[PDB]
């Protein structure tokens with residue numbers, strides 16, 4: 001008799017094998033990055049490890065509040081973060097009938113956006129990477145206060161209706177309107193409010209240390225990137241894109257499309273994993289699903305929903321499902337989310353740098369002519385390559401243009 | 412009522428999430444390699460696409476057989492590949508009682524190894540990368556003829572015993588001793604013989620073309636590697652390792668440990684996937700399991716069994732299980748496989764370069780002091796980093812030493 005030892009199978013790397021267990025290409029990345037930067041990092045963590053006075057700068061800011069206006073705006077955000085809580089406590093019981101409460105919420109939410117978009121423009125002494133750290137706070141606060149309105153209104157209407165008729169600290173409606181949990185919400189790494197968030201058992205000092213080291217390593221890595229690889233390429237030709245021709249633009253962009261993409265990947269891993277896990281660890285949060293696998297995204301429409309899960313499940317719950325419930329024309333809703341995304345794009349990248357060329361708008365617009373294209377022609381492990389190319393020459397380029405035209409006009 | 416939207420989960424990159432679906436970090440590798448070399452490759456495929464006369468070189472070899480001794484040896488291998496088949500056909504029916512047949516097989520298998528190990532040493536006009544392409548053929552032929560002996564002997568004893576008492580072309584014992592299937596075995600990408608191999612339906616011109624392009628791209632890539640990154644680093648200090656001190660050796664090795672590892676990874680993907688899939692495609696083979704996931708190998712003992720599956724399932728069937736069945740002391744068998752692996756190492760890397768420093772033997776020996784260490788201390792996504800480090804500063808270094816000491820002594 002014969003019992004065969006050769007089955008009929010496929011190589012693990014092959015397209016039609018369906019293996020998908022490459023956790024270890026990832027550790028190769030980590031090991032190589034560490035072997036290549038684990039002396040420059042140990043030297044920079046010394047030369048900047050005692051020469052940053054992390055306690056004297058707060059006293060120098062206390063020495064003058066009107067200088068350094070960026071932390072001034074960040075602390076000023078509490079005015080809105082408290083006015084909204086005050087509206088909630090007002091209509092929590094008997095005051096401020098839903099009409100007035102809703103109009104007050106709309107006014108407060110509008111001023112959260114319109115106040116820094118005015119301060120950072122008029123006030124001159126503000127820095128671009130310091131203006132961004134006020135706008136990326138006054139949009140997160142706006143997105144959080146939107147849902148803080150919505151969840152409470154929904155639960156309050158539910159209690160109003162239940163007025164027409166537990167032990168495991170599951171906080172009911174009115175008992176969640178304390179300052180402590182509002183603040184815990186604001187710092188929590190999520191944009192969708194919810195009574196009695198999940199919690200994690202402990203703090204896990206090890207995990208927090210590893211995440212802090214990831215942040216301190218990746219910021220140093222991409223500073224190395226910006227200084228060595230991308231500033232020389234720019235100042236070899238300090239001609240700003242605002243006047244160059246659509247033929248020289250591309251010639252000069254191909255020399256930056258790769259380093260740009262690399263610093264964007266490093267931004268993602270530094271921000272959406274390491275920083276948000278440090279936050280969600282200190283304040284025991286436990287959810288920690290900030291991104292799905294956007295990398296193996298066979299089509300771009302699937303990539304748009306899996307990086308930055310917080311924003312996407314905020315959309316799908318407070319912008320999409322509400323405006324399909326009491327509405328229709330779902331394509332109009334997809335358009336609405338595209339327009340809101342374009343507004344926040346052109347508000348976060350164009351306001352701090354005071355440019356309004358509306359390049360990022362063309363970048364967001366040219367995604368649909370690319371989305372339908374990739375979803376129509378490519379499939380599988382070539383649709384994934386189409387998405388990976390779109391992430392190189394697509395949207396991040398439309399921010400590289402702004403930062404290039406700014407660095408050129410000033411150095 | 413409240414139905415929560417925040418579960419209690421972990422980030423996909425985190426150690427304790429168990430995601431393992433990173434097919435798309437891999438396509439990122441492919442896309443980046445292609446964007447970075449997809450002009451140099453299109454230029455080199457032209458400058459060498461018509462200036463290689465792929466039909467005149469066979470006529471120049473026919474013009475003189477004693478010059479170019481490497482293809483002479485490769486074609487001479489058929490003497491043994493036919494003597495073994497003749498022994499099989501002899502004792503297939505009535506001649507050559509098992510004693511004589513076994514002794515003839517032992518003699519032929521010994522001369523397969525001892526003949527080129529003598530020709531390439533004495534004959535002077537032979538080149539190192541041309542001597543390697545005769546030794547890596549006379550060991551594959553030896554390993555194949557071993558199992559060609561064993562399978563046939565086992566089936567023949569089975570027929571002898573069945574003498575003490577179908578339709579789907581399942582070839583029985585004696586009808587598999589034709590020249591056609593012996594040759595099909597020799598070129599088949601496997602080292603373990605088996606009557607009626609699996610088969611694939613068609614040839615799939617697309618797949619064959621993609622594999623050929625992978626070969627032509629990766630060889631060009633690693634020639635770029637050897638020329639740009641590693642030859643300058645060597646000829647900045649042309650002092651051969653044979654006399655340098657154990658303190659300067661390491662100082663000079665750290666400048667090559669990464670490029671070496673990169674060309675070894677490229678060797679793996681060029682050889683164990685692309686070339687073997689091209690072969691297994693032309694001759695419709697269908698098995699195509701030439702490697703398991705050796706990358707996510709949490710311990711080195713698991714890496715030793717999952718790269719190069721052909722050799723491992725040859726060991727486990729013709730060297731390991733036979734010598735545990737009629738034997739014992741399994742640790743002695745693990746030692747035996749280590750010793751055979753060391754012999755083929757020091758036979759394939761040391762004979763073509765005529766060096767016998769027995770460095771690769773220390774490299775193979777220092778794996779067990781490393782194997783037990785990694786398996787004892789590290790676990791999980793840090794054991795995988797231990798394995799990835801062992802693959803950088805471990806065995807491949809012990810071949811880089813040979814090739815360095817050879818390139819230095821000659822250029």
Ligand SMILES: CCCCCCCC/C=C/CCCCCCCC(=O)SCCNC(=O)CCNC(=O)[C@H](O)C(C)(C)COP(=O)(O)OP(=O)(O)OC[C@H]1O[C@@H](n2cnc3c(N)ncnc32)[C@H](O)[C@@H]1OP(=O)(O)O
Nearest residue numbers: 539540543715716722723726731748752756759760810818
């Ligand atoms: C001008 C300049 C110069 C020009 C250029 C010139 C160039 C010239 C130079 C050019 C360079 C050339 C350089 C060449 C370099 C390469 C040469 C090499 O080094 S080739 C190395 C090949 N190495 C191997 O193939 C691996 C060795 N073999 C293996 O790994 C085997 O698979 C082996 C024998 C080790 C198998 O062992 P186990 O890994 O299975 O371990 P166990 O403990 O023995 O397993 C046996 C039993 O253990 C149990 N077991 C094992 N793991 C278990 C588990 N996880 N759970 C439960 N039971 C388990 C099972 O019951 C298993 O059973 P059951 O064998 O079926 O009877």
Ligand SMILES: CCCCCCCC/C=C\CCCCCCCC(=O)SCCNC(=O)CCNC(=O)[C@H](O)C(C)(C)COP(=O)(O)OP(=O)(O)OC[C@H]1O[C@@H](n2cnc3c(N)ncnc32)[C@H](O)[C@@H]1OP(=O)(O)O
Nearest residue numbers: 128129132304305311312315320337341344345348349407
């Ligand atoms: C030297 C000076 C330097 C100084 C520095 C300078 C500083 C400045 C520089 C730089 C700073 C950086 C500034 C710029 C940064 C970048 C800015 C941005 O880009 S802003 C981010 C954009 N983020 C988004 O836009 C998220 C996008 N989110 C989404 O798109 C959504 O998730 C959305 C609405 C698309 C979700 O929808 P869907 O993808 O599911 O679409 P649908 O079809 O509506 O899904 C709904 C229903 O569809 C069905 N459906 C969909 N897919 C299905 C399937 N596969 N099978 C079956 N049914 C399916 C299901 O039934 C689903 O239902 P059900 O409502 O969820 O319960």
Ligand SMILES: CCCCCCCC/C=C/CCCCCCCC(=O)O[C@H](COC(=O)CCCCCCCCCCCCCCC)COP(=O)(O)OCCN
Nearest residue numbers: 013014015016381382385438441445446449621624625628
């Ligand atoms: C006009 C230029 C044409 C391309 C010339 C350069 C590339 C030549 C060959 C390179 C080696 C790779 C061959 C094609 C891919 C084979 C593997 C493959 O399918 O990769 C797939 C992923 O890779 C791709 O899809 C890559 C496709 C090409 C992407 C880029 C094409 C447009 C840009 C090319 C020129 C760029 C110039 C840039 C100048 C600044 C999936 O991988 P797998 O799991 O290994 O699949 C095995 C088969 N099921």
Ligand SMILES: CCCCCCCC/C=C\CCCCCCCC(=O)O[C@H](COC(=O)CCCCCCCCCCCCCCC)COP(=O)(O)OCCN
Nearest residue numbers: 026029030032033036225228262265266269295424436439
């Ligand atoms: C030789 C001249 C040097 C000039 C100075 C520059 C030196 C530094 C150059 C390049 C370093 C940055 C290149 C990689 C950028 C991507 C970083 C990255 O891995 O982003 C990842 C985020 O992106 C993704 O997950 C999706 C895409 C991943 C693609 C693979 C990224 C790693 C590539 C490594 C390249 C090889 C080493 C380079 C240095 C020798 C985070 O992964 P991780 O940290 O490896 O894994 C976490 C495990 N807990």
Ligand SMILES: CCCCCCCC/C=C\CCCCCCCC(=O)O[C@H](COC(=O)CCCCCCCCCCCCCCC)COP(=O)(O)OCCN
Nearest residue numbers: 027030031034035038039210213214217424425426792796
């Ligand atoms: C003899 C001189 C010794 C000098 C000191 C040792 C070298 C220090 C080097 C780097 C320290 C800073 C590393 C920053 C990035 C750390 C990332 C990290 O811890 O990743 C962890 C994973 O780590 C790894 O995969 C490997 C980490 C160890 C790599 C090997 C380091 C020691 C060996 C090389 C040291 C010498 C390098 C320079 C040689 C010229 C967490 O992984 P995950 O998959 O993202 O998540 C699971 C748990 N969340």
Ligand SMILES: CCCCCCCC/C=C\CCCCCCCC(=O)O[C@H](COC(=O)CCCCCCCCCCCCCCC)COP(=O)(O)OCCN
Nearest residue numbers: 013025028437438440441443444447673676677679680706
């Ligand atoms: C910007 C210049 C290119 C940098 C690209 C990033 C660094 C290299 C990228 C990825 C390396 C990932 C290593 C994972 C090792 C896993 C084991 C293994 O055998 O991996 C396979 C083999 O990996 C490799 O062949 C990659 C090894 C590193 C090659 C590095 C070459 C650097 C060349 C730089 C050229 C720059 C421009 C020069 C202009 C003169 C994965 O291969 P694949 O082609 O993705 O096959 C899939 C086909 N569907």
